[PDB]
């Protein structure tokens, strides 16, 4: 669970980096499908699956929009992300292992883009946060 110290660190970091969410999202999904090509299985219905594509760019917007939602809902991610969880559970059937992969790529993206802001202390809290987001997304799974 996230402590008030964790919650403050995530909020202060998102305050700093959130205006680049769209870019973050592009970069992270791009890394995800290049470094972890098995994840491309979930996007077989797209015209293609290649880094920085318009589809990856738009999907990145949507995903980091979800992270912005989670930041605003940080005091109760379970409740805050329930609707998203039902979508991933029934419609998309995404194996929860993949949330772990994309969380790593987000951390790599942020490190590259905001190295001064992404301190170790920021990192421990955001990691705890992203694990909580992953758990909340699996809430409707089983």
């Amino acid at each position: 669970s996230l402590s008030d110290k964790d919650k403050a660190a995530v909020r202060a970091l998102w305050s700093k980096i959130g205006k680049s969410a769209d870019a973050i999202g592009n970069d992270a999904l791009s890394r995800m499908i290049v470094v972890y090509p098995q994840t491309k299985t979930y996007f077989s219905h797209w015209p293609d699956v290649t880094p920085g594509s318009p589809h990856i760019k738009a999907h990145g917007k949507k995903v980091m929009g979800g992270i912005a939602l989670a930041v605003s809902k940080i005091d109760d991610l379970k409740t805050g992300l329930m609707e998203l969880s039902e979508q991933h559970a029934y419609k998309l059937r995404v194996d929860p292992a993949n949330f772990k992969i994309l969380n790593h790529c987000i951390l790599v993206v942020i490190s590259t883009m905001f190295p001064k802001e992404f301190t170790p202390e920021a990192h421990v809290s955001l990691d705890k946060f992203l694990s909580g987001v992953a758990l909340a997304l699996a809430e409707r799974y089983r």
Binding site: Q38, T39, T41, Y42, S44, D95, A97, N98
Partner: peptide, 14 residues
């Protein structure tokens, strides 16, 4: 499994 079925390989472990 990858190119025709699009099966996530983590499912294999499960």
């Amino acid at each position: 499994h990858s190119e025709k079925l699009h099966v996530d390989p983590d499912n294999f472990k499960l």
